[PDB]
Structure formats: C-alpha cells, structure tokens
Design an enzyme around this catalytic site. Sequence first.
Site, mmCIF file in Angstrom:
data_model
loop_
_atom_site.group_PDB
_atom_site.id
_atom_site.type_symbol
_atom_site.label_atom_id
_atom_site.label_comp_id
_atom_site.label_asym_id
_atom_site.label_seq_id
_atom_site.Cartn_x
_atom_site.Cartn_y
_atom_site.Cartn_z
ATOM 1 C CD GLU A 158 2.961 6.522 6.430
ATOM 2 O OE1 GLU A 158 2.779 5.314 6.124
ATOM 3 O OE2 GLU A 158 4.104 7.009 6.606
ATOM 4 C CD1 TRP B 283 10.570 9.636 7.939
ATOM 5 C CD2 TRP B 283 12.666 8.829 8.022
ATOM 6 N NE1 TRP B 283 11.309 10.263 6.949
ATOM 7 C CE2 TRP B 283 12.597 9.785 6.985
ATOM 8 C CE3 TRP B 283 13.882 8.181 8.267
ATOM 9 C CZ2 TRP B 283 13.698 10.093 6.173
ATOM 10 C CZ3 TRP B 283 15.000 8.506 7.464
ATOM 11 C CH2 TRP B 283 14.887 9.454 6.435
ATOM 12 C CB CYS C 165 7.286 4.970 -1.862
ATOM 13 S SG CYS C 165 8.357 5.563 -0.536
ATOM 14 N NE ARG D 105 8.705 6.625 -5.574
ATOM 15 C CZ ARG D 105 8.280 6.731 -6.829
ATOM 16 N NH1 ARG D 105 8.960 6.177 -7.831
ATOM 17 N NH2 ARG D 105 7.181 7.437 -7.080
HETATM 18 C C1 HEM Z 1 12.200 6.952 4.928
HETATM 19 C C2 HEM Z 1 10.912 7.301 5.114
HETATM 20 C C3 HEM Z 1 9.775 6.818 4.263
HETATM 21 C C4 HEM Z 1 8.582 7.461 4.197
HETATM 22 C C5 HEM Z 1 8.226 8.733 4.913
HETATM 23 C C6 HEM Z 1 7.730 6.748 3.317
HETATM 24 C C7 HEM Z 1 6.420 7.189 3.052
HETATM 25 C C8 HEM Z 1 5.509 6.344 2.424
HETATM 26 C C9 HEM Z 1 4.113 6.567 2.420
HETATM 27 C C10 HEM Z 1 3.412 7.710 3.126
HETATM 28 C C11 HEM Z 1 3.534 5.569 1.711
HETATM 29 C C12 HEM Z 1 2.055 5.423 1.440
HETATM 30 C C13 HEM Z 1 1.241 4.771 2.558
HETATM 31 C C14 HEM Z 1 -0.204 5.254 2.407
HETATM 32 O O1 HEM Z 1 -0.522 6.279 1.727
HETATM 33 O O2 HEM Z 1 -1.114 4.634 2.989
HETATM 34 C C15 HEM Z 1 4.562 4.717 1.253
HETATM 35 C C16 HEM Z 1 4.295 3.618 0.467
HETATM 36 C C17 HEM Z 1 5.340 2.757 0.200
HETATM 37 N N1 HEM Z 1 6.646 2.869 0.542
HETATM 38 FE FE1 HEM Z 1 7.559 4.285 1.438
HETATM 39 N N2 HEM Z 1 8.351 5.655 2.849
HETATM 40 C C18 HEM Z 1 9.613 5.629 3.350
HETATM 41 C C19 HEM Z 1 10.586 4.638 3.167
HETATM 42 C C20 HEM Z 1 10.388 3.469 2.416
HETATM 43 C C21 HEM Z 1 11.279 2.373 2.314
HETATM 44 C C22 HEM Z 1 12.603 2.254 3.057
HETATM 45 C C23 HEM Z 1 10.738 1.453 1.409
HETATM 46 C C24 HEM Z 1 11.310 0.138 0.984
HETATM 47 C C25 HEM Z 1 12.623 -0.151 0.957
HETATM 48 C C26 HEM Z 1 9.476 1.992 0.992
HETATM 49 C C27 HEM Z 1 8.601 1.407 0.105
HETATM 50 C C28 HEM Z 1 7.259 1.789 0.024
HETATM 51 C C29 HEM Z 1 6.280 0.915 -0.659
HETATM 52 C C30 HEM Z 1 6.531 -0.400 -1.358
HETATM 53 C C31 HEM Z 1 5.087 1.514 -0.556
HETATM 54 C C32 HEM Z 1 3.768 0.994 -1.115
HETATM 55 C C33 HEM Z 1 3.205 -0.166 -0.261
HETATM 56 C C34 HEM Z 1 1.896 -0.683 -0.831
HETATM 57 O O3 HEM Z 1 1.655 -0.796 -2.074
HETATM 58 O O4 HEM Z 1 1.015 -1.023 -0.021
HETATM 59 N N3 HEM Z 1 9.330 3.216 1.594
HETATM 60 N N4 HEM Z 1 5.799 5.208 1.679
HETATM 61 C C1 LIG Z 2 0.951 -4.830 1.722
HETATM 62 N N1 LIG Z 2 1.065 -3.454 2.176
HETATM 63 C C2 LIG Z 2 2.040 -3.385 3.280
HETATM 64 C C3 LIG Z 2 1.590 -2.541 4.460
HETATM 65 C C4 LIG Z 2 1.253 -3.193 5.675
HETATM 66 C C5 LIG Z 2 0.837 -2.454 6.794
HETATM 67 C C6 LIG Z 2 0.776 -1.052 6.689
HETATM 68 C C7 LIG Z 2 1.114 -0.391 5.473
HETATM 69 C C8 LIG Z 2 1.523 -1.130 4.367
HETATM 70 O O1 LIG Z 2 1.863 -0.471 3.134
HETATM 71 C C9 LIG Z 2 1.826 0.960 3.108
HETATM 72 C C10 LIG Z 2 3.276 1.411 3.420
HETATM 73 C C11 LIG Z 2 4.350 0.679 2.921
HETATM 74 C C12 LIG Z 2 5.673 1.092 3.246
HETATM 75 C C13 LIG Z 2 5.905 2.253 4.081
HETATM 76 C C14 LIG Z 2 7.233 2.674 4.410
HETATM 77 C C15 LIG Z 2 7.423 3.799 5.234
HETATM 78 C C16 LIG Z 2 6.302 4.501 5.702
HETATM 79 N N2 LIG Z 2 6.456 5.675 6.549
HETATM 80 N N3 LIG Z 2 5.063 4.082 5.371
HETATM 81 C C17 LIG Z 2 4.854 2.957 4.575
HETATM 82 C C18 LIG Z 2 3.501 2.553 4.247
HETATM 83 CL CL LIG Z 3 1.160 2.085 9.569
#
Ligand code: HEM
Ligand SMILES: CNCc1ccccc1OCc1ccc2ccc(N)nc2c1
Ligand SMILES: [Cl-]
Lengths: 362, 362
Positions: free
Chosen positions: A242, A237, A65, A68
């Site tokens: 994405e 958000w 993520c 963070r």
């Molecule tokens: C506030 C704006 C946020 C943005 C812009 C953001 C952005 C992202 C992005 C771009 C990814 C990667 C998705 C990809 O490359 O396909 C990601 C992954 C992730 N984000 Fe965030 N995120 C945000 C908030 C959060 C929140 C609130 C949580 C949990 C409380 C979170 C937990 C995660 C997790 C667990 C992943 C990995 C999911 C996986 O392994 O499939 N994020 N985030």
């Molecule tokens: C098991 N993976 C959960 C998942 C299901 C469907 C779409 C994306 C996912 O994970 C990628 C992911 C996870 C968390 C996110 C939080 C915020 C954000 N902007 N993108 C995020 C993208």
């Molecule tokens: Cl999505």
Amino acid sequence: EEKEILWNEAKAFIAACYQELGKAAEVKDRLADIKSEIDLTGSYVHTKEELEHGAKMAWRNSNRCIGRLFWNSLNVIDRRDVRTKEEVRDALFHHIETATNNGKIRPTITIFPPEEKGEKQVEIWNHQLIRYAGYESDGERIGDPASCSLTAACEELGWRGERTDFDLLPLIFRMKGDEQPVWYELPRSLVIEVPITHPDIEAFSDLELKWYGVPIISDMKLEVGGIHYNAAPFNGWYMGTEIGARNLADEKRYDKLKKVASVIGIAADYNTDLWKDQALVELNKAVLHSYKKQGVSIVDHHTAASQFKRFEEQAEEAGRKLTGDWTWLIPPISPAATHIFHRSYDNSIVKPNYFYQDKPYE
Amino acid sequence: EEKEILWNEAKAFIAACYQELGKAAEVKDRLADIKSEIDLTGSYVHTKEELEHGAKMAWRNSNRCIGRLFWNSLNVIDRRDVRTKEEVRDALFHHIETATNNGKIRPTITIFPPEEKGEKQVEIWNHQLIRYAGYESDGERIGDPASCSLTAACEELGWRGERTDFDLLPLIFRMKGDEQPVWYELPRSLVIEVPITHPDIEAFSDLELKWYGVPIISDMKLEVGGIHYNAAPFNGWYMGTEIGARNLADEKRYDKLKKVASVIGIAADYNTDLWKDQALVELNKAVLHSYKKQGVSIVDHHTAASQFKRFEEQAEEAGRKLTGDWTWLIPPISPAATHIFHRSYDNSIVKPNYFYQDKPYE
Ligand code: HEM
Ligand SMILES: CNCc1ccccc1OCc1ccc2ccc(N)nc2c1
Ligand SMILES: [Cl-]
Ligand code: HEM
Ligand SMILES: CNCc1ccccc1OCc1ccc2ccc(N)nc2c1
Ligand SMILES: C[C@H](O)[C@H](O)[C@H]1CNc2nc(N)[nH]c(=O)c2N1
Ligand SMILES: C[C@H](O)[C@H](O)[C@H]1CNc2nc(N)[nH]c(=O)c2N1
Ligand SMILES: [Cl-]
C-alpha cells in the site's frame, strides 16, 4: 416508516449476532425490548457486546479487505458517551496511542455516537487520523496530492502547513450544532514515522522517504443493525504494497519510481528494461525492511494472501459464505503469485459493514 | 426457428459491417439475397469482404484482449474451400509459416468451413497449433501440465513424446465423418523457438529455458453474423508477461521461480525479501531480451498498455462503445503502473467475437 427499516435491520442483526455468541435464547426478549424502544424513541441502543461483535462482523464482511483473518481480535473502544470536542479530541489521541502500542500495532476501532436522524453528532473531516498534507500552486507540487483538497480546507480554518512533503495534517472535525469544524495539531510524540532505507543499497536514504506507522481510516460509516456510526475510525497494520506500490509510486501520489531507479543504479529510458517493475520491487523491499528494522508491524503481500487463504478456509468450516472483491483483493505487485488471482469471489454486500460516505467539503 | 436466429444475427451484422465499410446502400439488396439463401438452404455464405471484416470486428470486441489497437491490420486467410485432411494440414502449416514471417510476426487468422447444423466440418484438437506436451506419472512431472490431458489423448492415437520438457505436440484434428482425429508431427523448420538468456546474468542460461515464437490459439469459435466458425485459428505476438509471469512462473505450469532465484543469486527463504517478485522481474526482463535478441516480435506490458490506451482513444473518436474485462486486461506484473488498473471497463459481450467451445476429449 424508517422505524420500519430500522426494525428489520435490527431483527436480522440480533438473530445472527446472538446466534454466533451462543445466546440464541435471549434473542426473543432482547428483540421485544428493541421493538418497544424504537416505538417510543425512534431508535435503539446497542449493548456493549452487540456493538463489539457488530464491528467485528463488519470487518469480516469487508469484501475488499485481505486482512480479515483477524476479524475476531479487533479491539473495540466504546465512546458513545462523548459530548464535547475536547472529549472527541482526547478520544482520537488515545486511539492513536493505543492502536500504535509502541510499534506492535493493535487493530482497533473507536466508536462515537451514531447518527440520530441522519444527523451526525460528530463529523470527522480527516480521511485518516494520520495523513500528509498536499499542495499544488503555480505548477508546483508538494506533499501528497491525495490530500490537496482537505489541506486547502484546513488552511481556510486558520491552519497553515510548513510545506514540506510530509506535513502532518491536523485532526479536524465538527460537532453537531457548530457551523465550522475545529482543528487540533497532532502531538508528534504520538505519531510514529518510519524512514525508508534499503537492506543493501545505501544510497536509497538519499531519497529521504518516510511514511507513518499506522493507517487509521476515519471516513467510513460503520453500520450495525440499522444504526449508523458515521464516526468510527479504525486501523490495521499496513500491507507493504500500500505504501511501496501505491502511496509512494502512483503518478498521482508521490510518484517516486524514477527517483528509485536512479539510486538503485538502473536506467529509466526503455519500457523493455522493465525498470518500473524493478524499481517497484526494490522500493517495496525497502519499505518492509524499514518497518521491520524500526519494530513497527507490517505484512508483505505474500504472507497477507496466505492469511486470507486461511480466512477462506475458516469461513467454509463455520458454514459462512465468503464474499470478496477480486479487483481489490489482488495485490498491485505480483498478483498472479498469490492464490487470490487464480480464483473468483462473490462481491455481494452483507451487513454489518463499513461504507463510503460523502465528505462535507468537496 | 433457428432460421430465425440466423437471420437476425445476419441483419445486425450486415448493417454494421457495410456501414463501417461505407457500403450502407448495398445493405438492402445483400440482405434480400441472404433472406432467400437462408430460406432455401438453411444458411448463408459470407463474401470475402464480410468474412475479413467480421474477423476484424471479432478481435475488436474481445474484451480480454489488450492488443486490440491493431484489429484493422489482421491478415485474414479464407480457407472455406478445404475438404481433405491433407488440405487442412497444409493450411495449418502455411498459417504457421506466414504468421511467423521469419520472426517479424504477422497477426493472422485462417478460417476453415463453418459448422453446418452445429456439425463441425473440421474439429481441431490443439489449444494452440504450437504447444509443449505435458506428462505426469508416479509423482514425476515433465513438460507443461497445461497440456497433460491432450498429451494423453495423442498418445492414445499412436503418437509418443520424447519426454523432454519441451516436446512439440503434433497437430491433431478430426474431419467430419471420421471417428478418430489424425495427427501430424510439426516440421521443426517451421517452428521458431527462443532460448531464454538474461541481458547481464550469464548463469541464467543454466536454467535451459526456452519458449516458442508464436502463440496461435486454435480452440475458440469465431462467430460472425450467426455463422459459427469453430475452426479458425489465429495469432498475435506475445506480451512478455504471458511467458515470464505465467507459462514459466505459475506453480501449475513450469514453476521456475525458485530456480530463477538461485541463478540470480538471491535467497528464496523469506516472503519479506520479496524474492518471488524479484525473480518474476528478472525472468520477465530475460524473456523480452531473448525475443528481441533473436529478432522475434514481442511487446512488454507497459508498451502494450500504452497501445491499448490509444485503442480506447480511437474507439471514442469513432463513436464506438468500448468494452473490456478489467480482470484480464491488467497485466500480472506491476498492474498498478498501467492506466488500465486505475479505470473500469464495461464487460458487455458484443458480436462478432471469439468464444470458448468444449474440447472433444476431456
Ligand atoms: C490488520 C491488518 C490489516 C490489513 C493488512 C488490511 C489490508 C487491507 C488492504 C490492503 C486493503 C485494500 C486497500 C487497497 O487495495 O488500496 C484493505 C481494505 C479494507 N480494509 Fe483492511 N486490513 C487490515 C485491517 C482492517 C481493519 C481492522 C478493518 C476494519 C475494522 C479493515 C477494513 C477494511 C475495509 C473496509 C477496506 C475497504 C475500504 C474501501 O472500500 O475503501 N481492515 N484492507
Ligand atoms: C473511503 N476509503 C477509506 C480510505 C481512506 C484513505 C486511505 C485508504 C482508504 O481505504 C482503503 C483501506 C481501508 C482500510 C485499511 C485497513 C488497513 C490497511 N492496512 N489498509 C486499509 C486500506
Ligand atoms: Cl494509506
Ligand atoms: C498482436 C498482438 C497481440 C497481443 C500482444 C495480445 C495480447 C493478449 C493478451 C495478453 C491476452 C490475455 C491472455 C492472458 O491474460 O492470460 C489476450 C487475450 C485475447 N486476445 Fe489478444 N493479443 C494480440 C492479438 C490478438 C489477435 C490477433 C486476436 C484474434 C484475432 C486476439 C484475441 C484475443 C482473445 C479472444 C483473447 C481472450 C481469450 C480468452 O478468453 O481466453 N488477440 N490477448
Ligand atoms: C480458450 N482460450 C484459448 C487459449 C489457449 C491457450 C492459451 C491461451 C488462450 O487464450 C488466452 C489468449 C488468447 C489469444 C491471445 C492472442 C495473442 C497473445 N499474445 N496472447 C493470447 C492469449
Ligand atoms: C476466473 C478467475 O478470475 C481467473 O483466476 C482469471 C483471473 N484473471 C486472469 N487474468 C489473465 N490475464 N489470465 C488468466 O488466465 C486469468 N485467470
Ligand atoms: C474502480 C477501479 O476498478 C479502480 O481503478 C480500482 C482498481 N482496483 C483497486 N485496487 C486497490 N487495491 N486499490 C485501489 O485503490 C483500486 N482502484
Ligand atoms: Cl501461451
């Protein structure tokens, strides 16, 4: 014997959490009470403070993520009290409404009762609370292929999609005891959608693209001090890439790049023209413009990476080790233009954290 | 005791090489002769066939290389006979001329005598045979920062650069026995350069950008069956992104993105405009157009990735394990549009292979 694992995970968690919360002195007596609670009951219950802070740490420790920086402002809703499918439904509806906040998105998580013996109290089938259905039959392809199998499973339960490219899937989940999940149609009044238009290519609206405002991930388990919250949907958000570089661009998703090239007036015949790259850029510019014009929160990959650099700097000052997954942290568009691409990251897994868990169907 | 390591590396290598060459029966007697040669001499000498094939395998095993489809057509020049700095010089000049081939680039490697006791017979100081000098002093920055330190080392040896942004560094290398390396100015007649123009934005030529035709890497060691060829410069043709998305774009290289935005008529004020991405795309389109217009070989990242997919398919058919470094194989521009991004690769190191070795200076 699993009373063992739980206790160790609980010691590690309470020590670190109470430490970060300036409550180091209360660790000993709180551990005492937990040590006894596990003994008698086979488990322990988190205080509201431990649960809120654990969910925050879990986000902080999410290697993949880039968002963070804002871990500490996560809005945590404690819904461990729910016992009925009407309550779950209403909790899920509220989450959508409160996270959306009329477009000014609040990162939020709603936490349901945790697994008991590895037995789920509530088992959510959606991958996101708001997602589009997908269909394939007789060569024909409609909607979002990523949703083909969940869509087929809802249609086994007496739901039927209209078969547009943007049918909203219903909420679908199962309560402990029940053999089948129930499903509820989403009230359209709760779901903000954004039509995709381009800042200065007016033909772009001919593509009739749109996307929903808030990505609310509902398929990961939140683990905090040995307690397994299999149902704990959360949202941020969107980062514009994405939507613009993956959901709408991937050949196995909406596959729009050729259509984009056409409306932006360029040929899609020769790799050396870099037409896919140019299409990707205009599509991504369009997405950011549309979210901004509609007053729905979004971040571009450059600002996001800058925030993450601040996250890296903040982690060092606090003396926290940083962990990260370079392969997911780099954005899929111009990754070398962000500092992320040019450094490496330790991909170790630290708890609390969010984890993949199997879906019931598939 | 290192006679040990050499022998094992030699058995592994000869077995596999003779196998691939349909000469499995000749393995036993060739190993015999090697076993004795090591005993007496402390080393063994490759046949022309083993050396050519080893250099080819080494390219085949380069995890970070997307261009490997063509491993078997590598043009190998055996220069193990050189004893003088005039010979080395003339060998290096020839390599430039023959690899360049008037623009229709031939992937080529020239192989010099190998390390004796870890003692280099020939020690090449250039990172590429053709590279631009870099200077920094009193805040001022000219040329290619990647070359700042080698540039300062040449200027210790009585060379002096004109201080344009595109001074050609001389060839510089040291012969066993000598305490200082010698340097030789490159004959401009041998060095093709390509002025960067854009297919339809005529102002692009105001940037006065150019780059050289052939990337000839001179700082890696080729290792084949325990023999260490520290001096064995090789070339391919460029993938357009290496020039347009890195050499010319990186802030720590030529840092041209803002200048590109200006000549292409777009603002560089707001991240949400994705001006860096758009600049990157037009700069990269320009590079491919200029190489093609000038009749100098080049490949775009899309075609390159397609070739590499064919490499992956060819490896499976031959029953060879594929190894690769995902983090270098994905291109720095639209990586998600290539199949590479969406799969993973085993980064194991198999020999023969090319390896990093320390430079003398720095
Ligand atoms: C506030 C704006 C946020 C943005 C812009 C953001 C952005 C992202 C992005 C771009 C990814 C990667 C998705 C990809 O490359 O396909 C990601 C992954 C992730 N984000 Fe965030 N995120 C945000 C908030 C959060 C929140 C609130 C949580 C949990 C409380 C979170 C937990 C995660 C997790 C667990 C992943 C990995 C999911 C996986 O392994 O499939 N994020 N985030
Ligand atoms: C098991 N993976 C959960 C998942 C299901 C469907 C779409 C994306 C996912 O994970 C990628 C992911 C996870 C968390 C996110 C939080 C915020 C954000 N902007 N993108 C995020 C993208
Ligand atoms: Cl999505
Ligand atoms: C014919 C055209 C070729 C193309 C287009 C090509 C393309 C590339 C690219 C793009 C990289 C990565 C550079 C980066 O991402 O910064 C690379 C790495 C590499 N290539 Fe190739 N290559 C070609 C031929 C060759 C040849 C002939 C050899 C050797 C015989 C070779 C060996 C390597 C090695 C060793 C690396 C990694 C270097 C390192 O670790 O720093 N390639 N190649
Ligand atoms: C020690 N690394 C060698 C090196 C020195 C200077 C520039 C790039 C380098 O390695 C990357 C590299 C290596 C080999 C290549 C062969 C062909 C090509 N088009 N790019 C290539 C890029
Ligand atoms: C070590 C670290 O991953 C480093 O920043 C890498 C990232 N990936 C890369 N990929 C390519 N193609 N070229 C590079 O020079 C680098 N640098
Ligand atoms: C497992 C394999 O690396 C896979 O293709 C990854 C590549 N990196 C990724 N990076 C992001 N941001 N999102 C993804 O879905 C993937 N998929
Ligand atoms: Cl280069």
